[PDB]
Design an enzyme around this catalytic site. Structure first.
Site, PDB file in Angstrom:
ATOM      1  N   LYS A   1      16.820  -4.558  -5.634  1.00 12.15           N
ATOM      2  CA  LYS A   1      17.300  -3.756  -6.765  1.00 12.15           C
ATOM      3  C   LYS A   1      16.158  -3.015  -7.483  1.00 12.15           C
ATOM      4  O   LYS A   1      16.276  -1.821  -7.778  1.00 12.15           O
ATOM      5  CB  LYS A   1      18.075  -4.634  -7.768  1.00 12.15           C
TER       6      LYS A   1
ATOM      7  N   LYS B   1      10.926 -20.567  -8.413  1.00 10.63           N
ATOM      8  CA  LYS B   1      10.789 -19.139  -8.707  1.00 10.63           C
ATOM      9  C   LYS B   1       9.547 -18.874  -9.568  1.00 10.63           C
ATOM     10  O   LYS B   1       9.100 -17.736  -9.683  1.00 10.63           O
ATOM     11  CB  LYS B   1      12.053 -18.587  -9.382  1.00 10.63           C
TER      12      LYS B   1
ATOM     13  N   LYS C   1      16.061 -13.508 -13.191  1.00  9.39           N
ATOM     14  CA  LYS C   1      16.624 -14.322 -12.110  1.00  9.39           C
ATOM     15  C   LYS C   1      16.850 -15.689 -12.752  1.00  9.39           C
ATOM     16  O   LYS C   1      16.314 -15.957 -13.824  1.00  9.39           O
ATOM     17  CB  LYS C   1      15.636 -14.450 -10.940  1.00  9.39           C
ATOM     18  N   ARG C   2      17.640 -16.546 -12.121  1.00  9.17           N
ATOM     19  CA  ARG C   2      17.873 -17.875 -12.677  1.00  9.17           C
ATOM     20  C   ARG C   2      16.551 -18.639 -12.831  1.00  9.17           C
ATOM     21  O   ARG C   2      15.622 -18.455 -12.042  1.00  9.17           O
ATOM     22  CB  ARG C   2      18.864 -18.672 -11.815  1.00  9.17           C
TER      23      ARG C   2
ATOM     24  N   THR D   1      17.397 -10.918  -3.798  1.00  7.78           N
ATOM     25  CA  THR D   1      18.072  -9.622  -3.767  1.00  7.78           C
ATOM     26  C   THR D   1      17.714  -8.809  -5.006  1.00  7.78           C
ATOM     27  O   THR D   1      17.749  -7.579  -4.972  1.00  7.78           O
ATOM     28  CB  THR D   1      19.602  -9.744  -3.630  1.00  7.78           C
TER      29      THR D   1
ATOM     30  N   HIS E   1      21.976 -20.208   2.774  1.00  8.88           N
ATOM     31  CA  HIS E   1      21.272 -19.524   1.683  1.00  8.88           C
ATOM     32  C   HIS E   1      20.100 -20.294   1.043  1.00  8.88           C
ATOM     33  O   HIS E   1      19.498 -19.787   0.096  1.00  8.88           O
ATOM     34  CB  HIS E   1      22.248 -19.102   0.575  1.00  8.88           C
TER      35      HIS E   1
HETATM   36  C1  LIG Z   1      27.465 -26.645  -7.559  1.00 13.57           C
HETATM   37  O1  LIG Z   1      27.241 -25.240  -7.699  1.00 13.57           O
HETATM   38  C2  LIG Z   1      26.357 -24.563  -6.886  1.00 13.57           C
HETATM   39  C3  LIG Z   1      26.091 -23.225  -7.174  1.00 13.57           C
HETATM   40  C4  LIG Z   1      25.207 -22.496  -6.384  1.00 13.57           C
HETATM   41  C5  LIG Z   1      24.564 -23.111  -5.308  1.00 13.57           C
HETATM   42  C6  LIG Z   1      23.646 -22.320  -4.464  1.00 13.57           C
HETATM   43  N1  LIG Z   1      23.227 -21.165  -4.785  1.00 13.57           N
HETATM   44  N2  LIG Z   1      22.477 -20.599  -3.974  1.00 13.57           N
HETATM   45  C7  LIG Z   1      21.924 -19.393  -4.131  1.00 13.57           C
HETATM   46  S1  LIG Z   1      22.178 -18.448  -5.530  1.00 13.57           S
HETATM   47  N3  LIG Z   1      21.132 -18.991  -3.134  1.00 13.57           N
HETATM   48  C8  LIG Z   1      20.481 -17.683  -3.122  1.00 13.57           C
HETATM   49  O2  LIG Z   1      21.208 -16.869  -2.186  1.00 13.57           O
HETATM   50  C9  LIG Z   1      20.767 -15.507  -2.183  1.00 13.57           C
HETATM   51  C10 LIG Z   1      21.705 -14.704  -1.292  1.00 13.57           C
HETATM   52  O3  LIG Z   1      21.425 -15.008   0.077  1.00 13.57           O
HETATM   53  C11 LIG Z   1      19.303 -15.442  -1.718  1.00 13.57           C
HETATM   54  O4  LIG Z   1      18.797 -14.105  -1.849  1.00 13.57           O
HETATM   55  C12 LIG Z   1      18.426 -16.394  -2.537  1.00 13.57           C
HETATM   56  O5  LIG Z   1      17.132 -16.417  -1.928  1.00 13.57           O
HETATM   57  C13 LIG Z   1      19.044 -17.801  -2.620  1.00 13.57           C
HETATM   58  O6  LIG Z   1      18.305 -18.651  -3.505  1.00 13.57           O
HETATM   59  C14 LIG Z   1      24.829 -24.448  -4.999  1.00 13.57           C
HETATM   60  C15 LIG Z   1      25.722 -25.175  -5.796  1.00 13.57           C
END
Ligand SMILES: COc1ccc(/C=N/NC(=S)N[C@@H]2O[C@H](CO)[C@@H](O)[C@H](O)[C@H]2O)cc1
Ligand SMILES: COc1ccc(/C=N/NC(=S)N[C@@H]2O[C@H](CO)[C@@H](O)[C@H](O)[C@H]2O)cc1
Ligand SMILES: COc1ccc(/C=N/NC(=S)N[C@@H]2O[C@H](CO)[C@@H](O)[C@H](O)[C@H]2O)cc1
Ligand SMILES: COc1ccc(/C=N/NC(=S)N[C@@H]2O[C@H](CO)[C@@H](O)[C@H](O)[C@H]2O)cc1
Lengths: 811, 811
Positions: B655, B549, B543-544, B651, B352
């Protein structure tokens, strides 16, 4: 099957079955193919609890409309045990549920064994609270029990290599079907901080806040459609609490929530632990806010004592006194004198012990940090109280220091018992002799100042749990002759005196006991792989392990019997099964040694081929309410052998009396009144009276004198010392011997000879089953006084100022 | 009221009403006189959940009888949001419940607002898991989601003085009606200990044990009567854990239970924290035992991959690979090579992100202490893997060190992504461009070794939550023209292309948006006392908060607009409401500064009288799933402006597209495919492509060059530096300026000019509502590809080896 268990009507059985199936499906998400026995228990519990809901809502609605005086029973312990059977009993649903489950292909008794005890108490004081709640509901009183919802109750006791091991009692693991969380009535409780004095009085500021979330449990009366509430508080951190660092701050929420985590098991020795102090304030602060809220939802606090009674179960909730003062003075702006009058008229205090090491004496430095405003209020109470003493007894300077709430010394302490007396309109002991001892010795000064405050309220037990539930066979044969009314009017058992010569009744009483003994003998083999002779005399001592309760004296008798058998192996003796059970407080070393001694004796006695099945010594592991319900009906002989003047009342004693065991006991606590009710001829009384103990103390107790003059006693001590009962660790019991010989506060040797002789008379009577049973009938017939219904009616009339009622609420 | 919400039949409405009343009484112990709005929510939730139970039992029974291949989706995050409306939607109960509650005198929408979000995730990855579960159920797959039941989910965000404050998300405070505890399936999980090598292989001994207790949550498919399970594990101490000292031992149980206490919120920067490692193993160990148990309840592990697929959602559950090897080799006694074959065929891995600081690289010393046997297995995997690399690329020594699972350096680390590739039969990225970047850059070496492993699976969203639930007005006007089938076959939306010239449809689409904007404008004033112009263009970026971003780029545009207005106040500009929302990870300082900047801009812009209602800047507090459901339907312009090559998919973008907003975006992640589906003419594309970014990196990115050549940019930087947006703390934003000028990894300045010009074209189009709406229709009509039903059908066919089914199970 049996009449006192109620009707099993076609309509009710059909409805119970369908509701059971509904809960299995919708509530438990199971069908019969995958359902575990625990699932079946839960489906039944939900089915039964459904029957309480309407009665619960309408009872509470009734109290709102009629606005009677409310009774608040504050306790840090409610030793409730299991709830399923008790609910069925009080709703007359037992036979219907038995039938309904039988038709579903299930054994209801098996399902009942799945329920965890609610073990939210240590022993007598906690169980008394539970019996009281049952009686208050049965007597139609607008009563609320308030306590703490401990996540962990009294530890489960395991015996490993003869030693007590403790494990956590995770009683909520599978969920509790008997509680309803009430997060809408969540209240803040304050700790620490500091006091600011403004122009507008004192203010308590910069506090740390813990939330108190209530859980309500129904308390059904006996077939009167009354359902009262027991409200238990759980500690919750506020959401901004402590808010990497983020993660830690969330993890630290545990610190706040630890307040309601675990019941303190140290019923032997007061420990000034901060967490225990927090628990005591937590219950008091949350409860008082709830009380005041309910009172306002009826400005004029003059009527407060007309609408509110608060009963303090020992000193554990004694902070209610300065907390009520705090709220009245600091928040409601009443003047001191009016607030004090309201407080005194509202509060009453029950004392449960005279042992000095059990008395709560909180270090001033703890109260200063945790509860700064309460300390100031306590100081002010003390000043005003001592001014009264000085005016009543001018120049008596030693009386002033004796009566002070503040104890001077190494660390200054607050005597919480003195606080309770000063701030209560009534102070009671729990048996006639105990209440007399309070007036004559430990609270003598207070009695002289305010004699009107001192009362007696002899303890009792509920005949619902302690006869109908645990001994249905006995309840039934009694009901056959005298009807069912005695279940809520236990004095009616006197009518049984006219059956003492009745051959049919004698036979039935003896048969019920034999059945109970057979059932218990079977329970032992199944769950513990231990084998016993059901024709032997069942000699039982069950209660917490304490030096004052003298399990050690019982041990000495057991060894005496073993030695006498070994000396004359071919002589006839009445076979006994000696059962001893009870938990020791985890830090109480001597109590732990006593358990090990009992098992060590068992190890020798139970494997001696010459003994045979004539003597067996069994330690009953994990003694708790559900186990008491099993062993008490099976007992022949009840051991109540505390040193005279040490057991405030006892309540185990009353349970055995109601269930057809004879009592061997000292004239201590309620034993005195039991012997008085039954007749001394029908009781096995031995040993020093209180006066004899006092005489011995003045002269000085010398154990050596007994050792020197009693050859059988000398032999036992030599056996203990030399390692007869611990071959591989010959000195294992040196602490026990040393204590008995040089520092025995409880005079074990002094009662030894009389005890052994008395035990011989017990064995003599047991040889004559017909005369044994006639004496049993005379005990059951005179057990009526010891119903907690009588006890509560006396509190109601003599302390709370409310009339009990046996009238039904409509269904 | 509206057709897609289902039938409100007389029989169903009557039954819903009676079951609501039943739950209020028996379940909540309330009547209508004392019931709180929360009580009403719970009565409704229980009423609805009752409808799931039969379908849930029969779905799971069906899987047992048919024994299809099972899909196990392992994730540390499931960002579920609220469950009540979603359950009604999937059961076609919405209109019936609306009617039933209306007749009871209640507003169902008001009741829906009471439910807490299940916030068990951070953002995109967590929400993807949730959309996937919905699609797997809708597609009739035998799928189970497995994760952790965090006591605390993602923190609630408060804004105080423009700054983010975090508070604990105590989402379980009032109880969760959507879970069923399953303590009968409690499993032990092992930590620490050591490895012994015997004659009979390795043994992992002297471990500490934590219990894993499962909670099951139903996952209903869309009107197909399928109900799948999401099983979340909770950590429980064993009862002999650590067993004064007694009290402490009970209090210490918290340490074990802390494993499932809180979701890690640091989605920006991998932290090698031991507690996080414990969480990762905890979910993996419990899940794998559960999988193996279910598989045996069907010796021959050859069939394991035919009956089991495990999907690893990022590397977080990567320990599944050595755990499966551990069980197969150490416990089942399979030889290494066979165990490995089974493992590889069973596991698949989804990546991801490409940001290096987010990649999990666990210190060897941590694994050595916590998981000694797993480390040994990882070393052995590495040796065998590197032997393969050496055979394929002889003499390429740098490839060996690049591909190693073990990273040498200061602290040795395990690269968990390398572990995942080595031990999986399939590796996929989440959008076409992201999957290409994986093959070409970060996993290039692995692609060269095993090209067959690498796939693409472009992300999607569920059209149930993200259209029908959140935007019923839009769903309805679509259904009026093309029927209801598109809800589970989103490609059918293409049929809307023939309505792009339809005057009635153009009007309806624009009307639905206006209504959504009015509803959201009302939500803001009511819950937050902030006032907005509903006729303005709703410009939203939610978004976060992350540098990649580029919320900062959006800020620069906002200030540009403000400065242009201030320069020519009497010139017409299209009014905008600019909304930015999202949480910053608690330790991410720059993200926290960005939030403060946004609020600081709002403070100046929103109170400038010359601006009027022409420009408003609002920070949307506490962005979460339930808030997304409100703001997304109301949006006109979707900001998707990450630096090309940094957003794997996105994503949120999908939406907004489904809900009738136009997109301004870079050619990054799924934006590329969205523009391809809709046509570039119907998308507002600007900025560097991936190739342009690469060109700039080779030359070196010099921000000063842009500052020097763009006067409008220079002005903004001068304003930020001088304290125009922070009068009392003139240097507040010095960190932001310094980063932009000297160390901007994300090239904010490089896209500034193109972005501003593109935004002018957006404003131009919005002036022509008819042409704006026609372009909107062309976006909605081509959004079909981005249904997670399409995504899951591709996983099913191309990775898991199972066929989806739209066939109903019987009711
Ligand atoms: C220690 O705690 C954490 C918590 C979260 C992460 C990683 N979190 N990773 C994310 S939320 N990844 C997201 O995934 C989405 C779905 O494919 C994509 O659409 C998006 O582009 C991508 O940034 C890593 C460590
Ligand atoms: C009359 O006696 C009762 C007691 C309770 C109820 C209703 N109870 N209804 C709920 S929802 N009870 C909950 O059940 C959970 C157990 O799964 C507990 O963990 C939780 O604390 C409790 O509030 C109804 C009747
Ligand atoms: C710190 O934790 C504790 C726990 C318990 C105690 C005191 N516990 N006190 C008891 S259990 N007291 C008992 O009360 C019974 C009821 O009146 C009497 O029958 C009995 O004679 C008396 O000993 C003190 C401190
Ligand atoms: C289809 O969807 C469902 C989900 C659950 C059930 C049945 N659920 N039945 C029980 S008893 N649920 C309990 O409820 C408590 C809330 O008071 C929770 O705290 C507890 O974790 C949960 O196990 C029935 C259907």
């Amino acid at each position: 099957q049996i009449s006192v268990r109620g009707l099993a009507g076609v309509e009710n059985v059909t409805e119970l079955k369908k509701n059971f199936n509904r809960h299995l499906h919708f509530t438990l998400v199971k069908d019969r193919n995958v359902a575990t026995p625990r699932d079946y228990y839960f489906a039944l519990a939900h089915t039964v609890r459904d029957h309480l809901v309407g009665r619960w809502i309408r009872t509470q609605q009734h109290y709102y409309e009629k606005d009677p005086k409310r009774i608040y029973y504050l306790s840090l312990e409610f030793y409730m045990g299991r709830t399923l059977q008790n609910t069925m009993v009080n709703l007359a649903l037992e036979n219907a549920c038995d039938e309904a489950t039988y038709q579903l292909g299930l054994d209801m008794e098996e399902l009942e064994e799945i329920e965890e005890d609610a073990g939210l108490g240590n022993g007598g004081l906690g169980r008394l609270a539970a019996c009281f709640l049952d009686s208050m509901a049965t007597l139609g009183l607008a009563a609320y029990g308030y306590g703490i919802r401990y996540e962990f109750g009294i530890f489960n006791q395991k015996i490993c290599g003869g030693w007590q091991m403790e494990e956590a009692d995770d009683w909520l693991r599978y969920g509790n079907p008997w509680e309803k969380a009430r997060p809408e009535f969540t209240l803040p409780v304050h700790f620490y901080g500091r006091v600011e004095h403004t122009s507008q009085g004192a203010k308590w500021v910069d506090t740390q806040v813990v939330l108190a979330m209530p859980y309500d449990t129904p308390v059904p009366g006996y077939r009167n459609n009354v359902v009262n509430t027991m409200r238990l508080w759980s500690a919750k951190a506020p959401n901004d609490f402590n808010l990497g660092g983020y993660i830690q701050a969330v993890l630290d929420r545990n610190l706040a929530e630890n307040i309601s985590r675990v019941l303190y098991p140290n019923d032997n020795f007061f420990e000034g632990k901060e967490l225990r102090l927090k628990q005591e304030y937590f219950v008091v602060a949350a409860t008082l806010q709830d009380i005041i809220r309910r009172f306002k939802s009826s400005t004029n606090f003059d009527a407060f004592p007309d609408k509110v009674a608060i009963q303090l179960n020992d000193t554990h909730p004694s902070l209610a006194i300065p907390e009520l003062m705090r709220v009245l003075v600091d928040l409601e702006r009443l003047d001191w004198d009016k607030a004090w009058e309201v407080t005194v008229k509202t509060c009453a205090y029950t004392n449960h012990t005279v042992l000095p090491e059990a008395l709560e004496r909180w270090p001033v430095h703890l109260l200063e940090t945790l509860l700064p405003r309460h300390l100031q209020i306590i100081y002010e109470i003390n000043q005003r109280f001592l001014n009264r003493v000085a005016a009543a007894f001018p120049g008596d300077v030693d009386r002033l220091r004796r009566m002070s709430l503040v104890e001077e010394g190494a660390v200054k302490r607050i005597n919480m018992a003195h606080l309770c007396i000063a701030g209560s309109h009534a102070v009671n002991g729990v048996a006639r002799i105990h209440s007399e001892i309070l007036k004559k010795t430990i609270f003598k000064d207070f009695y002289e100042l305010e004699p009107h405050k001192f009362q007696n309220k002899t303890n009792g037990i509920t005949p619902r749990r302690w006869l109908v539930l645990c001994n249905p066979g006995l309840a039934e044969i009694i009901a056959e002759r005298i009807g069912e009314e005695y279940i809520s009017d236990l004095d009616q058992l006197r009518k049984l005196l006219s059956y003492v010569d009745d051959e049919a009744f004698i036979r039935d009483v003896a048969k019920v006991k034999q059945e109970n003994k057979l059932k218990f003998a079977a329970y032992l083999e199944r769950e513990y792989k231990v084998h016993i002779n059901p024709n032997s005399l069942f000699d039982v001592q069950v209660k917490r392990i304490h030096e004052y309760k003298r399990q050690l004296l019982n041990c000495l008798h057991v060894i005496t019997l073993y030695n006498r058998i070994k000396k004359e192996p071919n002589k006839f003796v009445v076979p006994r099964t000696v059962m001893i059970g009870g938990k020791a407080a985890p830090g109480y070393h001597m109590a732990k040694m006593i358990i090990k001694l009992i098992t060590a004796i068992g190890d020798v006695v139970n494997h001696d081929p010459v003994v045979g099945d004539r003597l067996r010594v069994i330690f009953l592991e994990n003694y708790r309410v559900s186990l008491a319900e099993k062993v008490i009906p099976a007992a022949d002989l009840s051991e109540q052998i505390s040193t005279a003047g040490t057991e405030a009342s006892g309540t185990g004693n009353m349970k055995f009396m109601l269930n057809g065991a004879l009592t061997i006991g000292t004239m201590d606590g309620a034993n005195v009144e039991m012997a008085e009710e039954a007749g001394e001829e029908n009781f096995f009384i031995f040993g020093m009276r209180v006066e004899d103990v006092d005489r011995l103390d003045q002269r000085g107790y010398n154990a050596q004198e007994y050792y020197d003059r009693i050859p059988e006693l000398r032999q036992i001590i030599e056996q203990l010392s030399s390692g007869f009962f611990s071959p591989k660790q010959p000195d294992l019991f040196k602490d026990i011997v040393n204590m008995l010989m040089h520092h025995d506060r409880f005079k074990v040797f002094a009662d030894y000879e009389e005890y052994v002789k008395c035990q011989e008379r017990v064995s003599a009577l047991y040889k004559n089953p017909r005369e044994w049973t006639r004496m049993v009938i005379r005990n059951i017939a005179t057990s009526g006084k010891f119903s907690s219904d009588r006890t509560i009616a006396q509190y109601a009339r003599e302390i709370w100022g409310v009339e009990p009622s046996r009238q039904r609420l409509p269904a």
